[PDB]
Symmetry: D2
Amino acid sequence: HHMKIDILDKGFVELVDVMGNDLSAVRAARVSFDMDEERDRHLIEYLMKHGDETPFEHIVFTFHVKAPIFVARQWFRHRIASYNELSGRYSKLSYEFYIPSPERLEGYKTTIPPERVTEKISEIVDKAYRTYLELIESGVPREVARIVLPLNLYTRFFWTVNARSLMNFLNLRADSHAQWEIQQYALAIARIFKEKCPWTFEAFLKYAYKGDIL
Amino acid sequence: HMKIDILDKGFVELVDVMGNDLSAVRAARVSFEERDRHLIEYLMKHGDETPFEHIVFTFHVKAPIFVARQWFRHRIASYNELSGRYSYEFYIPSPERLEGYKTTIPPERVTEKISEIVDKAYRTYLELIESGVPREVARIVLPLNLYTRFFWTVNARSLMNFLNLRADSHAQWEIQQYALAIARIFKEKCPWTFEAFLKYAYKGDILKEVQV
Amino acid sequence: HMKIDILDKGFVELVDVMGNDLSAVRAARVSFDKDEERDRHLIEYLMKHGDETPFEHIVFTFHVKAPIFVARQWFRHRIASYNELSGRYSKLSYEFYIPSPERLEGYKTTIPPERVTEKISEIVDKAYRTYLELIESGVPREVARIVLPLNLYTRFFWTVNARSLMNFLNLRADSHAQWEIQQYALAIARIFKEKCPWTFEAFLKYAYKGDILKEVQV
Amino acid sequence: MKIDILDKGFVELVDVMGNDLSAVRAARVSFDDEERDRHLIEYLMKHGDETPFEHIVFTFHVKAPIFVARQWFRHRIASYNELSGRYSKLSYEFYIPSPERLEGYKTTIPPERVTEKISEIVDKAYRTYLELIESGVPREVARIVLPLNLYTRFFWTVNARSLMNFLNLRADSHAQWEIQQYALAIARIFKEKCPWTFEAFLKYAYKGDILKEV
């Protein structure tokens, strides 16, 4: 079980592990050891249709995610899940930042060329980072110095989430009303979910999924 | 599938598991031997339990409804149970379950009387079904020692809390037994975490004297 | 102040509530501070676009008396807090839901409905009698009680926020749920409407997935 | 009841359901002796029977820097609403540490100068943000250059048990100083509203240090 999808300039979503597959939901709904394709597919659709989503909780993913803090903050609002975020305490910290490409601004009619917007963002980021390093060099503790860093600082985290919670996540974030950056991560999550649970995923698209972009 | 028999007709069977002791080490370090084992200890020792949320089991449990009802109080877990609306076995305690208590009739007489009421209740239930009574109504006469089955999907942290509450002399003997089988499967799949849990975090009594 | 009798010896009683419809408006706006039409529109907007987090800031506590077969369906709702009666802090008592003949007319049976009631009552009586016999003999309660039927009444305190309550009404205030649980869910709905009228109507109009609360007043 | 924290922060009590007696009613499952009642509260707490305390609930209104809010929001057993432009006016303030914050640390650069550098960065980042907005960059993109010390506001609803778990993790000297201060304010309000429970918590269940010193 291993998949990686690159997101933004330096970000990613990688699959670390999975427990179960579409049949794990079939099994839990029946309380049985079944493994007959047709009737198992029908059952999955049937559960999805009638909003009987508990069986899908017995499918579980672990993801490793690299994303900017503004994205990670919205993400961590999903309470029915487990998070471990990068701290200095158990491994090395690094410092990269999401610089939007000029095409991110297309559609918006801006006073200055998109390339200049991109460059202004780079510049202010570079200044904050250099101030950060300055403070660290002077002996300011990391936990203080780091408050000058911008919301586009990349973080990394593991996320363990069951299929039901994942579908709820997709309903909120895989949507043209979500911020573009968020959507992009949600497409990656959907894509891995589709790979590992095609029947569940297709059933979710047909009957339960509330957004557009999938 | 590791499968452990409990009470007269019950069990705990392992359906699936995701990860192992290293799943917790990877998570704590956010990165895809004795060092890794030492990190587990260090985590458990300092109360940093979140890395263990990244290990997960699914169990198949057959238990008497009185035991299930206590078990289902553990909210940080997922359950799918057989429906009472849509087999019929009953936990009959052995005479030995009673020893330690002075009773005015002998233990084997207690066992017998339990069996008898179960028989009566079961037969009544069959008459009602036979008469057309729907099951969702007819079953309400069945006693709390009726066996049910369920799947249980639980992370290792929420599992250690469950072991904290149920693998302990102060819980009903019956659920201890189920908690011993759970401990046993946990220990098999996640030896380092399990030892570390006993040594630094486990608040109950029995697992420090009942092996596996 | 608010207690509703359910089944033959059951009830739903309201112990406490935090907040009202405006607790949800305040939370959506993140403002500790009133404009009825505008505030009602916000509640409709939240409910219509599926943003139900603001309703988590309204909370209820109930005291509920129900047969164990009902309680077990209820305790499957995990986004909530439960305190069930035990031998520890308070007195136990022993009562049972004996269904009336009406419960079964509608079903074609080969004995009269009253005969069903009579048979359920009998077996309850015998089970209970056996129980008290074992108790008098020294058998501890935790063992002796396993003979008692699933229609034994229990009590609990349930603390639940309005969002989680709405999910519960979705799943239980519905003709596909067992009739006994419908009846509890209708009492929970009535209270919830009395305290949070705006949220309860917006719920029905936009989010409610069941049948009965759209059929049956309060 | 409102407690000021950091330079522009606060914790304010919005609402509370119940008091010490709510846990006693719950434990006994009775809607129907002051000294008996405290004894039960100590008894519950010493034996780890903390479920009765779930029937006491608080709503807070908290103004805090994002770095703080991100650590706070990791407490999953609770309900949050964070300020959005969607339902209310947004504003732009930043946590500048006082020089006493560093006092304790041996720095190459005096504490007031650390304070000044943080302030300088904020001003520059904030001004870059404003330049972008003026240009026609949307807020959702422009705000990504803002530093982690930007204040945010949120409502937090949390039952007493979950609140005690929070105090265990954050009212402790190993927590970052800034969150400790919010944790002390939470604790004070807790103590005010639920004295018997708070007293019993310190005596039997509290795992931290600082609530026993202040």
